[PDB]
Amino acid sequence: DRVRSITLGNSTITTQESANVVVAYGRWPEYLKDNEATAEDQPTQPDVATCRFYTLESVTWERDSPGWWWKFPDALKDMGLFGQNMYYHYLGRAGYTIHVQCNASKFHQGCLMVVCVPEAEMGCSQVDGTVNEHSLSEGETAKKFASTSTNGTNTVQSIVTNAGMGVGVGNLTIFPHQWINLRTNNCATIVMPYINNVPMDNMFRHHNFTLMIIPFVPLDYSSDSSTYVPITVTVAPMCAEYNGLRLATSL
Amino acid sequence: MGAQVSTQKTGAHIIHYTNINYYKDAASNSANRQDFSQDPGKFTEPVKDIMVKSLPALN
Amino acid sequence: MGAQVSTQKTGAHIIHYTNINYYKDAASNSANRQDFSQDPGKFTEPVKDIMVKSLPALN
Amino acid sequence: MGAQVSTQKTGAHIIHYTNINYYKDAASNSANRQDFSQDPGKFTEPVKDIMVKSLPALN
Amino acid sequence: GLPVMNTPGSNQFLTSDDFQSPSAMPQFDVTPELNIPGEVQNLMEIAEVDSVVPVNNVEGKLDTMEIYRIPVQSGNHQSSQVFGFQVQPGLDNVFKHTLLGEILNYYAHWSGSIKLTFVFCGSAMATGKFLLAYAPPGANAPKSRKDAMLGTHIIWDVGLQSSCVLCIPWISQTHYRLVQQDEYTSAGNVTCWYQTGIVVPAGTPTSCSIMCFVSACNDFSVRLLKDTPFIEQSALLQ
Amino acid sequence: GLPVMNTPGSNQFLTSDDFQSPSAMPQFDVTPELNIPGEVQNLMEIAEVDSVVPVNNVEG
Amino acid sequence: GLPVMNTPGSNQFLTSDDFQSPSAMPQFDVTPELNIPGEVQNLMEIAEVDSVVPVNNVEGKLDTMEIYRIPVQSGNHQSSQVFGFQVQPGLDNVFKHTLLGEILNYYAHWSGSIKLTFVFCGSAMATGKFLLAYAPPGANAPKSRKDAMLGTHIIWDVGLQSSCVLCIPWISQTHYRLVQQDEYTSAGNVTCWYQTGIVVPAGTPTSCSIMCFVSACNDFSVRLLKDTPFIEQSALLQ
Amino acid sequence: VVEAVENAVARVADTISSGPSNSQAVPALTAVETGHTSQVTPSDTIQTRHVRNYHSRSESSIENFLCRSACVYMGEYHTTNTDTSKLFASWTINARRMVQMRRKLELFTYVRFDMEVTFVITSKQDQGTQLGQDMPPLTHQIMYIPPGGPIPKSVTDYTWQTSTNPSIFWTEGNAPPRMSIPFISIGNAYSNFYDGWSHFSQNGVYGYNTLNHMGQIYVRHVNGSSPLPMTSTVRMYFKPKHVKVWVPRPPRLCQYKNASTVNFTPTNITEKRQSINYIPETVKP
Amino acid sequence: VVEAVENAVARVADTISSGPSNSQAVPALTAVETGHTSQVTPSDTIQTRHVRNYHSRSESSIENFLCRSACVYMGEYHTTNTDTSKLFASWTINARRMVQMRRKLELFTYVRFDMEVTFVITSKQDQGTQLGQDMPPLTHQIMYIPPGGPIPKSVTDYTWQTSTNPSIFWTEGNAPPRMSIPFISIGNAYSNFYDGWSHFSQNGVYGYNTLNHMGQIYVRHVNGSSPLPMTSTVRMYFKPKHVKVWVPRPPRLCQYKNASTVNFTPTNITEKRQSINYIPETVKP
């Protein structure tokens, strides 16, 4: 009941302490069909060369950590053939399987929230100003929330209670989400379909969804337990499609 | 004359109304106030394996 | 068209009218002026044992 | 009463309307917006001998 | 022409009416409908989703995550109450900015049962039992475990299942209560007490925290729409 | 549009008329009806109840 | 009379409405209908007719026929590009006054595939091959035959059939693009290169010209009527 | 009695799936000299997927393209003046003075339809040193005169009796007047271009003004009033319906000059660019 | 012909009678880490009586929640002035300047509907030392311009011919004007939030202003009058109908700052109380 295995392409994930799997709105990923298509050229479907697990860089969960976020896509634009296909085409489409891992002993305590947010438009820490692209995303490196109000030009207002969006963070449960309670489980798994208002889109211009990881109960331990506790993310695209082949763009 | 007769909103514990469409576009029609459907499981129960609620959640 | 035809108030010693409902709520309908029921025994005869009125009340 | 009931313009992925004519002349009627015919070959293919489009045009 | 007569109400603009109106774009052709995931049909669907409650809303914590954490610890603390609050889902500070309270503040009347879920976030070696009690109105709030013992309550045992649900049932003399609650439409209170106590082995933290989620049951409804008092402006372009 | 003609009486307010009128609360959901004792249907029902007469209505 | 009530919109004049109206000439007898050749039923029918494109719209040629002629010649000119332009059928100077562009400028949204036909007007003894390429947007325009080789292209061989057709297919993330195109609704570019080169015998001219026609395919449509910016006046009587 | 009428919507063609090919069929090679436009699709030239297309060509039909009100004349007239001709407005009917409607109609050689005519009338108090009065609401009279009818000489001419001419009387503050007109021409269709003469010796009047001849419009105030001067403006709007058109033509390139002729000043084919290869860079950091 | 349509009302669930219990079924024990909300009722946790519940969730459906008129723009314009631009009003269409309607719409990520648009127009005599005149009733013109249309320069610009743009003419003293508008967007739905850029190099314009592009509105007086100055105010009201929405979001906590961005000032989670145990005494003599 607690064991799980997931296979995609030439990659496989096992786990012995999982809770369940969240299918975002009861909708599994799928390819675009004919009575919903607008673009006319025949699309390419690589199908094992792109649909497989890629692992990003880890972060260190310290006693005073506000939280982390990533933007998708553009966190996977340098990951093998998925990224190469992103560079050469005008239109792309894909769903995802996200898996978050964090293990600790039966003598530690803490609680993390793992949430996926579609169209997470963010605000600037200068009210009459605008954000730079660097402030929203550093590729495979995570951005970091703050515990107090922030200053600086072109940077995101990142105090963790407002989640960079002007809402109450305790309401983020309206989105697809799981929890990692250190006494209960050690991993979270979310399956996310393609969610947009058009059937396809350009993968450089538009961030489809943001992954947020926020500790609600801080990490705590006693006398001589282990101090280093990392968190790891692993994401696999699903049902990937591309249209509009031309010469490779450059940022 | 393409009339529609449907029931009015009343309480619980002569009650219908008639309507005619006059314009050629359906964007001119009145609001659709009498349709009451729901599907809450989309947001409250979005899990792969069904949870019975009389059984323990884990194990 | 969901019309209703009912009789008009007249005297004693061509007499009906038609009505259409236009609005979606029954709180928009006109008054109900032609219903004449009564139950006076609720206030004039509220006793447990029936009194015949030709017989003496007591004994 | 000589009413006409026809379908409204809608999209793809209760929808009809009624009309009455009041005037004695047809030049008083409303516009004819729901007729969509075509014959492009009159301007794009005005040739005597038919051209197959998979075969070469000449020879 | 046909003889007619105008009634009171002619030539007014009521902002909640429903009439037919001419189109300024005859025969416009709309974009086909796409089947996007996550379609919402009723606001009550949002109200049945749990959301975290800021129970620890005291001075100095209104802008930190500690506002969500209820503290508990080991030792003899049976006399100390854990928490208590009023049941006013649309008016009290504890509840008015959660998802349920946010939905309620667009309305004037509410009715139905409420769910409170409690989760224990200590180490896997901590054990303990708590008493969660709810008192209908008519008396003052209990000042001891013995008094609260007489209301509607559940005894929660911390184990491999980490979450307990206390349901507040609809006990009321009227069908609806006011979202802007007064003495007449009061609903009572909730309190928490130590049933046994928290016991831990050596090498484990001694202090821990509990969290609380709120949502609405499947008998819940609202009515009488109104504007919300949580948003405002001084001039246009805002 | 359809040709019409207004008659005397247009745009007046008679306090005993009976017309249809738009609702300022579309689709409001009313409280269910309760069966309370003592429902009155006609004023004559009150008139058939005896009541005491002040026959001795003299000064003092 | 019948009691009624007037709604908002009474007594206005909307210039796109459709109502019945009294005739100022009762029982007029119109002239019988004659069956004239060439009846038009849809504006798209005009859009599927080819028309010549002024590709060579450089300074000094805006009032001469040379604006329509693309020049080519023999010798080693593989490094030189023949032509290139953006795909903006209603906004770019190359396309806005052709029949298709003229029809589009009465509308706000367009969708569909486009046909470009190329005809070679050299002597019957000239031979050669050309590469015609189209690049969807997202990158800058190619600067060499090798880069343009990677897009959607056709290799045209000059022979007894004098005309080649390059079809631009509808590749877009939205169903419609704006006639007044911006960065968001861009569509890419077209370029031409020498695939082999032009070879001629003695006694023949060495320079030649190519012409280009544009038309719309059978999946093409427009919407959202508007006034055109190509006609104007300062006062009446014009 | 009710009668159901079924409307058929006409959507555009789908694209069919197509794979690789190596054969002798050459859909891409044509010959424009024939006068024939090639009917090729993307599926003949590339590999394509199957698409179900739901778009409709509804808003590009002639009826939807032409059935919209457009201004065709504006004029002014005073309540009091010392010229005797500035007290009423009059003109000859056509659609040649406002360029938008004219150019739109001139994409076709011949046209035939009915019309819906609307008038918009406004008034204003003339500038002066002494202002302020109490006038009743002004009333306006519009009379149409077919050719050969008697012409008014002033604002009190007997001809305003309008015994047989149709007229409209109107009061300010009400909805704009309107009436519909049938197809009235001695020919089988209206003619937008006429390459001919009025006289059998190939001289006289050239072109459009030979064939139109559709009467005049006169407009006056009815009150006969105004101790202090006032001015009114009348505007006319046309909307065609039940339309048919024949013989499409290339759209007008040069700007219009007058209402009687097709005269023009030579204009360029388009605007210039830097080079025959020039295309601007838009993907830059 | 008449056609009956049956409406199904959807009332809430009843509560079932329940007695004592002593078993291994544990409805009250759950695990929130799964992302699952518990579906328990009072009958699982206490003893209950049977109740027949007649309440309906009719007024919390999306259509009833959103179908109410709300103000979205207010503007002023004069009959006479020396600035030449204060004689007409104009703006770009959206629903982002008045906070109530904006916040209400922003509970959802994507929305699609038709609109009913109403205008409310009032006028007033400007303050001055010399008052008193006799003006006829004022008339107003409202013109909508889709993107790419010619823009008026003044109150006598030729562009007010409105040959193809839809316009409304209106006179003071009548009922407020109204018209309905269909769903007009090049996408499959309107977007309330857009986490992206306008340029393919990840710069340019950020967020909402990349996608809207729905034309402008212009409003003027028609009389061209007023010896003494006057001012008019126009207000616009929106009402959506035939609605569909997707992807709910948490409601806005911080106050709005401008109409182009989601920028905000950090705000508290709620307001404070004396203690985590504090609850006021209300039963006292």
Ligand SMILES: CCCCCCCCCCCCC/C=C/[C@H](O)[C@H](N)CO
């Ligand atoms: C009492 C008010 C009556 C108003 C009289 C308006 C009549 C207008 C004349 C009818 C003919 C107009 C029909 C169109 C004329 C031209 O043929 C077209 N503009 C194109 O040639």
Ligand SMILES: CCCCCCCCCCCCC/C=C/[C@H](O)[C@H](N)CO
């Ligand atoms: C002659 C008067 C015509 C009045 C013209 C009003 C047209 C208004 C523009 C139509 C589009 C409005 C529909 C709603 C726009 C936004 O998508 C929504 N506010 C939410 O995004």
